[PDB]
């Protein structure tokens, strides 16, 4: 979304109430995170707690391993509720953007004020706490959805093009899964059909091998600030933390069937945090439930059985495929009755163009026959 | 000689001259003007980026104790090898 | 207080008029260089300590575990001692932006603070000097402007073989 | 054919000999510009851009411009 | 060229097998391993840690090709002259009777 | 000292604006190998191995607009300076080298230590490593030197031959009306033949030199690329 | 909020200067947008007539610049140095004399390395002025 | 028929290109110069072969106009600029750039004098800038 | 790339295309400037500068 004066007024008016709300949310989220962190350190696997190192096979660069460096706490419901996890995720997003802004302020002193004016004029990078009414929150969510729409197609195209240019699927089922994974959101993708793409891509690029440019696209699509990007293991850490929390909440919901009892607005928020349900689509409860159930089915039985989710790259592509709208087409078909090169009509045809029309026109066969006969006669005379 | 003279830029328009002292001083004045305000604390990365490297280089110049002679950078004639002055 | 903005003009003038640099001023600058190196060393030590403290347990086990390059016996003993010391207690081991901040911000703050106060120390040292450079420093802090050609105005001392110019 | 390094493009035949032999040529339908069409000289009957302006006339125009360029200062010299 | 796989802990030969400039620096000579550069090179090759030999070299070259080369060329100290112009340490001091300005207070 | 001057491409910039306001397909590229680095399928690289395509294309266009059109008399190669070419090659080569070095993967340099464990490390392998590290920088220097020297020599030869042809054509054409006309006609025909040969040689050499210039940079990149196999 | 980062923020109407722009595009497209106009790296087109037109034009304007701006400096230097060492001394000559001097400079250029060397080397016994004539 | 251009080919022969399968083949065996179906495509042989398509008057059974619902997609975004609009913008920009470059070329090669002339009749000899002013203490 | 375009078969056809008309005009200039130089610089009344030995570029570049 572009900056506007109305949004600037909105954010300037709600600046200090927003900061106070952010501070209160910071205290609450620190409590929630402290509970989760203590539980992770106490009951987590040895590899997860010790932060086992996984290096790439080409340049031996460390990155998070989905199997070892991510852990789904199946018994987190005892200590932390689903709503608390959602609160922590939302606060993590807000805190990341606030932290980048605070870093800019500290770095540049008082010269960041005009950039702050640019910042408050847009809802893309302001915290959710700056909205004190429903309409303001709706506009803020619209800005977030617009940024997701702007960023997701590049991520999807990067993944698809690199794989298709450097590799191909092994079998027909993988071919169908790969082709159906990147369909536009106007058609419904069957998660059972699309799941094999996860293993196929695990053969190609696991989350531990994700490239820095692809990571930048993904973080843009997830509303995660990317400047300064720095090493890929910083925003990668952010992505890992966010999706680890999401998977913990998903296990809680699947096991306890909370989504069925979840209300309409809370269900919409739950889908939105999974990048499944844009607010501009005006989805009803039926559509939200369908998308959430498809997401759970994509996670698969192994997620509940062992807490192992499919490949994170393919999962992110699948969920962000809901922001891959059909390419726009505006204008009546009658516009195809016009002409594009009327401005050249005055120039006419030169000698070469006339020759080409004569040789390749409706009389082309006659000209070809005459030319070949003449050449044959000349060749015979020469011999 | 004459063939060698063909290999020169053909669209020279204007040449301007400025002493190193003068524009260095002007740049320092600009830097002081922009780094002076109170709302830019001395501990900010911007201020240190502006000042620390320059201070370090000037200190290195001052500490220099060379046994050889370095001819003045901006002499009128630096083409004579047997005349450093 | 921002001493660098005042001192840049003085340093440039000293470079331009370095002929009148007494051995005392040279010693002052050498001390400044030594203190800069010391500040770099201590800041680097702090950065290394913070990096080691925040390092992951598996990372430490790999780094301070077998094999031994030299295998003298002291090497293994030292590595085991450090590994046990680090892995005994609980350590906050952040990753990503967090480790960057924890390892860097203290280092930057320490280095900048030490350098700034050493710059103040050098300004005081030049204020206390009884040479033409010290007089220029005092005049700079008084009038706020650098007075070039000061050494030849107040007739600062010259070698016995170069006093003819002052002969007026 | 060629004019220095510029070679005249030639259309590749598309018909086979059997199909080609069955084609009936009727030059009455052809444009007047291309009658008795010759691949070795397709522009023999092509109209001139300017009526009465020959190629030799243009060549001579350039020669005269060169002579003017070299001889004008001989008749109307100017001071430094 | 091809992918590099680090050796396992069991695939690394013992330190006693490594050779120095003259011969192995075994017991009673272990502390000489620190000083023998060739022994360290052979040990690094044995442990597949060849980068310890290659990384310092290339970087050094880069450091010379990029930053120190020009510094030496433009600001280096040339060889001193035969007849040397030492400093008499007479310049700089204020003249007699001069009233220096007061220091800040 | 600040000299204000302009490049000799203003008419070509005008033509580019006129002829490329609308899109056109490009199917002929001087250095096509920057687009096809991998020839065996199922091989892929996690490094940004196609980052050089844009710079390669722009460099080819710029150097072609200068070098190829310099065959027209009085056309100036504005950048023809040894140290300026050094700056250009320094930018490209050192930028890619620093891209590989910022990766902080020291194992990438394992191949610098030439040979196998059988060869003596200090007296053979280490000296080969020294020579190879020297050879990287020498490759940079040779690239820029080759580009400079080829242009300089070609244009010197063209200028000298053109001067000779002008001299004989202007001051000895009267022999056509004399009894030694056959000698002048022989010399004139030889001069025409040498003229055509020199122009063709320069046209070929310019494109070949640009190809080699881009090939050196791509070789630097390829020396440090590692390819994974899809499974 | 002050300036848009998107090219879609239009500053003029779609029909602003439509006619002149269409004429300009017609001039550009007629010869260039053709199948046989396949360029080599955007620099060398396939159409012959583009060469036939642009090589002469480039040579013409470059030659005019060289003759009237670059070689004129050498010509004026020769005139000044050989006829007094000052501009006023040259201006004391008539236009015809200056024409003669400039054409002799052209002669020297055309010989260059192959002409006779008596154009600049004074043979012994020659009665013409030497280098110390004006000194 | 008109004199307008067609889908650009880049001077390539589609019967031997690396993406030849993307170009339909007609009855005569000549692959099209475009994604469209072409009945009269030909190949010309200069130093290199190149495919050419000659526009002609041909009637095609026109399926009736569909409803706007089944082909219009109203997913336009503020950042989106259509190809037609981009062509318009670039045409105007390049027109103005061409005029400016023309003026620059005329001035450079026909009006601008070269600096530092021997006679001093044309061009500047250079001068100093950034000289101090109102700083008596500087001297 | 030299792929195609109008190519006159002989001299007389250069007037069948405006671009080749300009080309043949330019060729006329190119080839006709040489005879003019022959006439001008091999003239009977052309006289070498009497002061040609006062100064030469050979002095200056040496
Ligand atoms: C005065 C001097 C200033 C120096 C100059 C500074 C120049 C600017 C540089 C930036 C400085 C920081 C700016 C503020 C950031 C906000 C605080 C913070 O860390 O937020 C958490 C957040 C953590 O991010 P993450 O990715 O989640 O971290 C992964 C970890 O695993 C996360 O760990 P976890 O997953 O286990 O979860 C823990 C989490 C759990 O907590 C929670 O969930 C609760 C929430 C806690 C965080 C709340 C943050 C709120 C941020 C907004 C604040 C309000 C702004 C209001 C603005 C308007 C004001 C009117 O709690 C944390 O986030 C803790 C993180 C670790 C602490 C980092 C702080 C270390 C530095 C401070 C100590 C310095 C002592 C000096 C001693 C001197 C000795 C000589 O920080 C960020 O978002 C990162 C900053 C983003 C900008 C980066 C810019 C480049 C930085 C380069 C620095 C290089 C070194 C310095 C030299 C530079 C020279 C060029
Ligand atoms: C009170 C408040 C509360 C307290 C404070 C709180 C903290 C606040 C601070 C933190 C806020 C963070 C969030 C900020 C968000 C907004 C950022 C932004 O700018 O958005 C674009 C923003 C609009 O954003 P938007 O409309 O919302 O669209 C956002 C979209 O999402 C589009 O988004 P997008 O992603 O597409 O846009 C991104 C775009 C952002 O960029 C832009 O959009 C560019 C903006 C500038 C465009 C200028 C165009 C106009 C130019 C005019 C030229 C002059 C004309 C003639 C004037 C004549 C005057 C007489 O690109 C980038 O991100 C590129 C980043 C580049 C980073 C560069 C890093 C360099 C590092 C150097 C190398 C170091 C290496 C290491 C070396 C180590 C050595 C040891 O742009 C503007 O509004 C343009 C303003 C133009 C102002 C006028 C022209 C300049 C005037 C200069 C005056 C100078 C006076 C002094 C002169 C003295 C002479 C001696
Ligand atoms: C046709 C002609 C037109 C005119 C042309 C003009 C001439 C241009 C010629 C040359 C242009 C190219 C130059 C390239 C240089 C090399 C760049 C390079 O090596 O980059 C490496 C690398 C590449 O960047 P990246 O992070 O990978 O991603 C860049 C993408 O663009 C990120 O994209 P993304 O999509 O991932 O993220 C989008 C979005 C994502 O949104 C977010 O992330 C949320 C918002 C983030 C807010 C910022 C947070 C910052 C946190 C702390 C950063 C570290 C501070 C370090 C300490 C301070 C040092 C000063 O981020 C933003 O929207 C960024 C907004 C930034 C707006 C400012 C852009 C510059 C406009 C000019 C303003 C300054 C004018 C000064 C001169 C005039 C003075 C009178 O850069 C970094 O690592 C970033 C380090 C940043 C350090 C701070 C800046 C250092 C430079 C000195 C600053 C001086 C300030 C002066 C203040 C006023 C004094 C009077
Ligand atoms: C990650 C990047 C990877 C990609 C790389 C890409 C590029 C290619 C690579 C190659 C580079 C290409 C070049 C590009 C241009 C870059 C700029 C450039 O070249 O500028 C040079 C440029 C050269 O200076 P210059 O401008 O030419 O002026 C010359 C003057 O000397 C200037 O004077 P100054 O006043 O500025 O002071 C400078 C001072 C700099 O040094 C200092 O200030 C003092 C020392 C600083 C230490 C820093 C911390 C180190 C760690 C501390 C301890 C940690 C452990 C703690 C726990 C211990 C527990 C036991 O150096 C000296 O003057 C020499 C003093 C040496 C004293 C030696 C006394 C004798 C005893 C010690 C040695 C012998 C020991 C024998 C033991 C035998 C045992 C059997 O700048 C400098 O080098 C000096 C300023 C910067 C200093 C930074 C200090 C940190 C360096 C990094 C250390 C850590 C990383 C390395 C190890 C990594 C291991 C994995
Ligand atoms: C205006 C301010 C200006 C600032 C200037 C200072 C520079 C910029 C400041 C910072 C800017 C912001 C961004 C920085 C880069 C961010 C990198 C990043 O994203 O890291 C993420 C990463 C977080 O990811 P993670 O998963 O938690 O951990 C990384 C993984 O392990 C990763 O796993 P992995 O698999 O990748 O493991 C590999 C990893 C393993 O390493 C690590 O990741 C561990 C952390 C680094 C350890 C480095 C120390 C190694 C030991 C040094 C021993 C030295 C002994 C010397 C003794 C001398 C005795 C005489 O990397 C390495 O192996 C690289 C080792 C370093 C090699 C250095 C080679 C240098 C060659 C020198 C050539 C010659 C130079 C010139 C000549 C000099 C002499 C004449 O962050 C870190 O690990 C630490 C980041 C620290 C950031 C820098 C803090 C800056 C503080 C500045 C203080 C001083 C200020 C001075 C101001 C002056 C006035 C203005
Ligand atoms: C004291 C005497 C004066 C001089 C003062 C100088 C002060 C210097 C300060 C100290 C600087 C130290 C460092 C110097 C380093 C120099 C290095 C260098 O030259 O490298 C070679 C290098 C050669 O580059 P290049 O390859 O030739 O390409 C650059 C070209 O500009 C072409 O590149 P491009 O085509 O890619 O450029 C983009 C181009 C894209 O194409 C275009 O836009 C086409 C137009 C091209 C224009 C630019 C080419 C200029 C051609 C020659 C001049 C044209 C005729 C001027 C007539 C003058 C008559 C006296 O767009 C533009 O140029 C944008 C500007 C368009 C302006 C349009 C104005 C329309 C006005 C309409 C008014 C209507 C009023 C109606 C009223 C009605 C009332 C009823 O130069 C540069 O890269 C640029 C160096 C500039 C350095 C900064 C200098 C400071 C700024 C000085 C401005 C002075 C303004 C005041 C003058 C007033 C008249 C006396
Ligand atoms: C957080 C750290 C805070 C540190 C606070 C201060 C700690 C106590 C003082 C430390 C010791 C200071 O003592 C320091 O000795 C060194 C010599 O070794 C002196 O240095 C002197 O001799 C060295 C000898 O090589 C010269 O290079 C140098 O130019 C000269 O100044 C310093 O001028 C003095 O400051």
Tab-separated table of C-alpha atoms and ligand atoms in Angstrom, chain A residues 15 19 22 26 29-30 33 37 88 91-92 95-96 98-100 102-103 105-107 228 230 234 237-238 241, chain B residues 43 45, chain C residues 46 92 94-95 97-98 100-102 104-106 108-110, ligand 1:
chain	number	residue	atom	x	y	z
A	15	UNK	CA	0.911	6.945	18.584
A	19	UNK	CA	3.057	2.546	22.446
A	22	UNK	CA	2.644	-2.360	22.881
A	26	UNK	CA	5.384	-6.892	25.647
A	29	UNK	CA	4.264	-11.877	25.683
A	30	UNK	CA	7.435	-12.078	27.766
A	33	UNK	CA	7.580	-16.819	26.025
A	37	UNK	CA	11.146	-21.410	26.747
A	88	UNK	CA	2.815	-14.406	21.175
A	91	UNK	CA	3.460	-9.793	19.268
A	92	UNK	CA	6.522	-11.307	17.596
A	95	UNK	CA	8.045	-6.535	17.988
A	96	UNK	CA	10.179	-7.277	14.932
A	98	UNK	CA	9.208	-2.043	16.227
A	99	UNK	CA	12.739	-3.326	16.840
A	100	UNK	CA	13.855	-2.372	13.339
A	102	UNK	CA	14.021	1.539	17.152
A	103	UNK	CA	17.332	0.408	15.690
A	105	UNK	CA	16.261	5.674	15.530
A	106	UNK	CA	19.258	4.727	17.675
A	107	UNK	CA	21.542	4.505	14.640
A	228	UNK	CA	18.896	-4.905	7.232
A	230	UNK	CA	22.264	-9.427	7.105
A	234	UNK	CA	18.780	-14.210	11.284
A	237	UNK	CA	15.729	-17.903	12.799
A	238	UNK	CA	12.657	-15.659	12.778
A	241	UNK	CA	10.467	-19.561	15.479
B	43	UNK	CA	27.819	7.633	20.670
B	45	UNK	CA	26.997	5.000	14.842
C	46	UNK	CA	35.061	-8.684	25.011
C	92	UNK	CA	21.586	-18.068	27.161
C	94	UNK	CA	20.572	-16.811	21.150
C	95	UNK	CA	20.787	-17.037	17.376
C	97	UNK	CA	19.679	-10.927	15.194
C	98	UNK	CA	19.762	-11.548	18.941
C	100	UNK	CA	24.337	-10.066	16.717
C	101	UNK	CA	23.036	-7.489	19.189
C	102	UNK	CA	24.394	-9.200	22.302
C	104	UNK	CA	28.123	-6.355	19.037
C	105	UNK	CA	26.366	-3.622	21.007
C	106	UNK	CA	28.527	-4.049	24.150
C	108	UNK	CA	30.660	-1.017	20.044
C	109	UNK	CA	29.700	0.842	23.223
C	110	UNK	CA	32.963	-0.036	24.965
J	1	LIG	C1	23.087	3.405	23.500
J	1	LIG	C2	24.066	2.729	22.568
J	1	LIG	C3	23.430	2.190	21.297
J	1	LIG	C4	24.413	1.474	20.389
J	1	LIG	C5	24.164	1.687	18.906
J	1	LIG	C6	23.011	0.888	18.332
J	1	LIG	C7	22.765	1.168	16.858
J	1	LIG	C8	21.532	0.490	16.285
J	1	LIG	C9	21.667	-1.010	16.120
J	1	LIG	C10	20.486	-1.792	16.661
J	1	LIG	C11	20.366	-1.748	18.171
J	1	LIG	C12	19.140	-2.450	18.711
J	1	LIG	C13	17.852	-1.691	18.477
J	1	LIG	C14	16.731	-2.098	19.407
J	1	LIG	C15	16.194	-3.489	19.154
J	1	LIG	C16	15.112	-3.894	20.130
J	1	LIG	C17	15.600	-4.880	21.179
J	1	LIG	C18	15.751	-6.266	20.633
J	1	LIG	O1	16.779	-6.887	20.606
J	1	LIG	O2	14.588	-6.733	20.174
J	1	LIG	C19	14.436	-8.169	20.108
J	1	LIG	C20	14.566	-8.598	18.673
J	1	LIG	C21	15.048	-10.017	18.560
J	1	LIG	O3	15.029	-10.412	17.174
J	1	LIG	P1	14.900	-11.958	16.809
J	1	LIG	O4	15.202	-12.153	15.373
J	1	LIG	O5	13.606	-12.434	17.346
J	1	LIG	O6	16.057	-12.611	17.691
J	1	LIG	C22	16.304	-14.031	17.625
J	1	LIG	C23	16.705	-14.514	18.996
J	1	LIG	O7	16.766	-15.942	18.994
J	1	LIG	C24	15.754	-14.057	20.074
J	1	LIG	O8	15.949	-14.872	21.247
J	1	LIG	P2	14.788	-15.854	21.729
J	1	LIG	O9	14.170	-16.470	20.534
J	1	LIG	O10	15.326	-16.736	22.790
J	1	LIG	O11	13.700	-14.875	22.363
J	1	LIG	C25	14.101	-13.884	23.332
J	1	LIG	C26	13.092	-12.768	23.332
J	1	LIG	C27	11.923	-13.061	24.233
J	1	LIG	O12	11.367	-11.799	24.667
J	1	LIG	C28	10.100	-11.536	24.341
J	1	LIG	O13	9.425	-12.245	23.643
J	1	LIG	C29	9.636	-10.243	24.945
J	1	LIG	C30	10.064	-9.024	24.142
J	1	LIG	C31	11.535	-8.692	24.297
J	1	LIG	C32	12.067	-7.753	23.232
J	1	LIG	C33	11.281	-6.464	23.086
J	1	LIG	C34	11.845	-5.537	22.030
J	1	LIG	C35	10.996	-4.316	21.751
J	1	LIG	C36	11.504	-3.486	20.587
J	1	LIG	C37	10.832	-2.137	20.437
J	1	LIG	C38	11.211	-1.143	21.518
J	1	LIG	C39	10.330	0.090	21.559
J	1	LIG	C40	10.594	1.081	20.444
J	1	LIG	C41	9.798	2.364	20.586
J	1	LIG	C42	9.989	3.351	19.445
J	1	LIG	C43	9.408	4.730	19.716
J	1	LIG	C44	10.066	5.485	20.864
J	1	LIG	C45	9.453	6.838	21.122
J	1	LIG	O14	13.754	-11.572	23.846
J	1	LIG	C46	14.541	-10.892	23.000
J	1	LIG	O15	14.154	-10.402	21.975
J	1	LIG	C47	15.952	-10.836	23.502
J	1	LIG	C48	16.980	-10.749	22.383
J	1	LIG	C49	18.410	-10.653	22.885
J	1	LIG	C50	18.769	-9.307	23.490
J	1	LIG	C51	19.293	-8.304	22.481
J	1	LIG	C52	19.758	-6.991	23.092
J	1	LIG	C53	21.262	-6.890	23.281
J	1	LIG	C54	21.774	-5.461	23.371
J	1	LIG	C55	21.382	-4.736	24.647
J	1	LIG	C56	22.409	-4.835	25.764
J	1	LIG	C57	23.563	-3.853	25.633
J	1	LIG	C58	24.408	-3.725	26.891
J	1	LIG	C59	25.593	-2.783	26.750
J	1	LIG	C60	26.681	-3.010	27.786
J	1	LIG	C61	27.930	-2.174	27.567
J	1	LIG	C62	29.190	-2.798	28.144
J	1	LIG	C63	30.444	-2.026	27.811
J	1	LIG	O16	15.563	-7.734	18.047
J	1	LIG	C64	15.417	-7.458	16.743
J	1	LIG	O17	14.356	-7.378	16.189
J	1	LIG	C65	16.750	-7.273	16.086
J	1	LIG	C66	17.051	-5.829	15.718
J	1	LIG	C67	16.592	-5.463	14.321
J	1	LIG	C68	17.431	-4.382	13.661
J	1	LIG	C69	18.845	-4.819	13.324
J	1	LIG	C70	19.740	-3.687	12.858
J	1	LIG	C71	21.189	-4.091	12.648
J	1	LIG	C72	21.896	-4.496	13.927
J	1	LIG	C73	23.409	-4.522	13.831
J	1	LIG	C74	24.090	-4.427	15.184
J	1	LIG	C75	25.587	-4.697	15.159
J	1	LIG	C76	26.301	-4.393	16.471
J	1	LIG	C77	26.220	-2.945	16.956
J	1	LIG	C78	27.112	-1.967	16.209
J	1	LIG	C79	26.512	-1.405	14.932
J	1	LIG	C80	27.499	-0.627	14.087
J	1	LIG	C81	27.130	-0.594	12.621
